[PDB]
Amino acid sequence: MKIFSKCELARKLKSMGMDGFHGYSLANWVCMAEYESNFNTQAFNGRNSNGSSDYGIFQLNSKWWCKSNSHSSANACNIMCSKFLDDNIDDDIACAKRVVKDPNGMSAWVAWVKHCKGKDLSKYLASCNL
Numbered sequence: 746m747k748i749f750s751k752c753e754l755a756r757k758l759k760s761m762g763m764d765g766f767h768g769y770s771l772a773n774w775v776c777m778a779e780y781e782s783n784f785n786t787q788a789f790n791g792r793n794s795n796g797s798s799d800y801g802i803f804q805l806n807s808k809w810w811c812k813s814n815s816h817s818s819a820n821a822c823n824i825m826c827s828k829f830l831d832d833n834i835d836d837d838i839a840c841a842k843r844v845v846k847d848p849n850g851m852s853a854w855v856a857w858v859k860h861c862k863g864k865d866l867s868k869y870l871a872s873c874n875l
Contacts, residue, residue: 747832749784749802751775752873759875761838767845771875772866773857774841778802780856786837787830801829803841804854810840 749757755775758764764771781804782788790799796816797808807813811826822840829837844853851857 747786749778749786751779751784752870754778754784754802755870755873755875757834758838761835763838763842766842767850769845769851770866772869773851773861776861776864776866776869777851777854777857780860781854786832786834789830798826800826801837802834803829803837804856805829805837805840805844810844 758774759771763774778784782802786802793799793806795808797806799806807818807826809819810822811824812818812820813826822843845851
């Protein structure tokens with residue numbers, strides 16, 4: 746079990762080349778995590794808008810991004826959803842990079858659309874050492 750703090754996640758994502766990935770600033774990535782899972786690596790949403798489930802710190806869905814025994818999936822990240830429930834988030838990050846390459850970009854994450862896209866994030870990471 747692991748629950749990141751904002752700046753710690755920011756440092757981790759920056760080290761994995763997320764700042765500016767596909768044009769999305771680091772603040773956008775961290776804000777998405779804050780609202781999707783509140784930085785909890787073991788976050789789990791049972792019934793999403795689909796009979797699917799959302800897994801991990803980035804709440805990746807089982808109908809499109811990963812495989813689960815519960816039902817069929819597009820499995821675009823080619824991986825078992827349970828791999829997104831561990832303390833290490835390197836796999837989650839690799840999948841997140843694949844997700845934003847699609848047309849919707851970060852709008853694939855509804856919590857980001859509702860709580861981050863419309864916010865002024867200029868000082869969101871101002872208290873961090875980047």
